[PDB]
Amino acid sequence: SRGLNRVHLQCRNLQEFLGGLSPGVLDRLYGHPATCLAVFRELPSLAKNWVMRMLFLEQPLPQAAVALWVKKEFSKAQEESTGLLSGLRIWHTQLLPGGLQGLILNPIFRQNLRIALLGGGKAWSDDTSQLGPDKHARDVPSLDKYAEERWEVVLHFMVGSPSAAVSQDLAQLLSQAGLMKSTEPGEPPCITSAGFQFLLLDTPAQLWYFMLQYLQTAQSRGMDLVEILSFLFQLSFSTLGKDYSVEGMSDSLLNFLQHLREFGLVFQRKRKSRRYYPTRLAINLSSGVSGAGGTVHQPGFIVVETNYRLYAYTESELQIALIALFSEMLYRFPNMVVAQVTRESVQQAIASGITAQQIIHFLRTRAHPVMLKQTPVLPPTITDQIRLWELERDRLRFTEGVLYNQFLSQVDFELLLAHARELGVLVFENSAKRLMVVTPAGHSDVKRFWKRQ
């Protein structure tokens, strides 16, 4: 069918990446800046206490004591909180410390974590180059406009600007990303399918994903460095630095920085230097979760009473662009109240697929202080409308397969059932007509098995 993992992936970002690489490569992910990165992109409350002992537990506590930390209530939730924390590779299962397996954390992270718990004037804490407010030469809400307009010149130039983007090689990665593409003559910076989905997204973590995928295109610099630097951005703002990012420089740390003002999240002066600037953007990456602080601009209340889109507030052109993809055809004047269509805005998801929550997110992101005095149930039936509209056009579930029909026997078919169910390469079976829907990737193992017998 259509891809649906490219939108969220907010724990696997630190798991499917990290578990997709080596323990020694994620040993590099225990830089002391990377310590806060561990605790927060995971959100269990249950593993979030299993850590809390280990600063006082040098000792490997026995497994059964915490396997029976929580009784009958929510054993699955304990188990669901367990192997994922183990799947972080942060733990070590001891063999027989006292007679039985008694688990314990990686201590080098415990080294790294406790400095981020109490004490330590270390390299990220102090002593080399961390941070520096000397005398105020430039202010944050002015730079917040930069932290707004670079998003525009990102997001508008995705759709296409009558203005122009700055000289970036990033478009040749965003065309590479499958968000954008370009045919060969003139290289038009269009959208393939996925930037359109990211047009429907609103958080910087996708940018972060292609910035994690920035080194992936045959580049060999510090992936260790940039993800430390990804944390090292996440310091709110309020720091110019007596060029403190060059006193704490590195190779990719300065060059890819030239791109962080292309990405806008840094602000560099003359010679791309002399200071550094983290933007207030450096806290919604940290979650990716919605956030009350993630309000960008505060337009007003909306409603969609009588499902007729029902709102005003002449906003900037990016929101106008955010509904130029989403509501034309009986636009009106100075209040942005394009009427409703149950077909066109329905057709305006066909190039995205379902924007189910992304409606609901942009429901609470159309005019931002709407949840101030409005109903909890903001769409009364209107979610289900949007749902049934999304549940209308999705008439297909694309799935290739290999089917086994006219089998010579009936009980050896149940063997090949049990053979494929052993393999887990079946998707479906019909025993009444001796049919099995088998994956074509796992076809060969049965193709090998049938030719052997």
Partner 1 sequence: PGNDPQEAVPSAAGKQVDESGTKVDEYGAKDYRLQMPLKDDHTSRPLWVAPDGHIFLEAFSPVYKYAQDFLVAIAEPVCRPTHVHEYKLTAYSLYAAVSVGLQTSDITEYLRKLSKTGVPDGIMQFIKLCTVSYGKVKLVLKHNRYFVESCHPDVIQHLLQDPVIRECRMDLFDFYEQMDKDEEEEEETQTVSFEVKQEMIEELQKRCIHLEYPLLAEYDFRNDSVNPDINIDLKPTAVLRPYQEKSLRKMFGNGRARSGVIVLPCGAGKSLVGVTAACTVRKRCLVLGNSAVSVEQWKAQFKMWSTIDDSQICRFTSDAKDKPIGCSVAISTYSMLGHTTKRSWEAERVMEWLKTQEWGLMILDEVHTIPAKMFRRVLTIVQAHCKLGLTATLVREDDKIVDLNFLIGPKLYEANWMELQNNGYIAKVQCAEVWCPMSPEFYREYVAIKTKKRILLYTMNPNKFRACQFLIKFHERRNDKIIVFADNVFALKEYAIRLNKPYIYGPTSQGERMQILQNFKHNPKINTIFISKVGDTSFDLPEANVLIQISSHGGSRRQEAQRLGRVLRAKKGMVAEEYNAFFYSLVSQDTQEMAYSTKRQRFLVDQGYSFKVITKLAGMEEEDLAFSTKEEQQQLLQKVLAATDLDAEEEV
CB of 139 to partner 1, least distance (A): 22
Binding status of residue 398 toward partner 1 by CB under 8 A: no
N-terminal to C-terminal alpha carbon distance within the chain: 35
> Beta 91-93 vs 402-403: how paired, if at all?
unpaired
- For the record, the structure tokens of 332 come out as 């009106």
Residue 437's beta-bridge partner residues? 403, 428
Among 111, 128, 142, 381, binds partner 1 (CB under 8 A): 381
**DSSP label at 282?**
B
| Binding window for partner 1 (CB under 8 A); candidates: 2-10, 268-276, 311-319, 425-433 | 311-319
What backbone phi and psi angles, to 5 degrees, belong to 394? Answer: -80, 55
Pick the closer one to partner 1 by CB: 16 or 305: 305
CB of 367 to partner 1, least distance (A): 11
CB of 165 to partner 1, least distance (A): 22
For 38-104, the DSSP string reads HHHHS--SSHHHHTTTTTT--S---HHHHHTSS-STTHHHHHHTTHHHHHTT-EEE-S-SSSS--EE
Residue with token string 């593409």? 181
Binding status of residue 312 toward partner 1 by CB under 8 A: yes
**Residue 106 contacts residue 90 (beta carbons within 8 Å):** yes
Binding status of residue 301 toward partner 1 by CB under 8 A: yes
Among 69, 308, 407, 450, binds partner 1 (CB under 8 A): 308
CB of 382 to partner 1, least distance (A): 10
Pick the closer one to partner 1 by CB: 336 or 425: 336
Radius of gyration of the chain (CA): 26
Beta strands in 312-423 (DSSP E): 402-403
Pick the closer one to partner 1 by CB: 56 or 333: 333
Interaction mask 326-345, partner 1, x per CB under 8 A = -----xxxxx------xx--
Compute the distance between CA of residue 439 and CA of residue 423 in angstroms, rounded to an integer. Answer: 10
Binding status of residue 305 toward partner 1 by CB under 8 A: yes
- For the record, the structure tokens of 408 come out as 């010579």
**Residue 197 contacts residue 359 (beta carbons within 8 Å):** no
Binding status of residue 130 toward partner 1 by CB under 8 A: no
| Binding window for partner 1 (CB under 8 A); candidates: 129-137, 223-231, 306-314, 414-422 | 306-314
CB of 374 to partner 1, least distance (A): 9
- The set of residues, in sequence order, having a beta carbon less than 8 Å from that of 305 and lying 6+ positions away, is none
Size of the site for partner 1 (CB under 8 A): 22
Which contiguous run of DSSP H or E holds residue 449? helix 443-452
| Binding window for partner 1 (CB under 8 A); candidates: 156-164, 279-287, 302-310, 434-442 | 302-310
Interacting residue ranges for partner 1, rule: CB under 8 A: 301, 303, 305-308, 310-312, 314, 320, 331-335, 342-343, 381, 384-385, 388
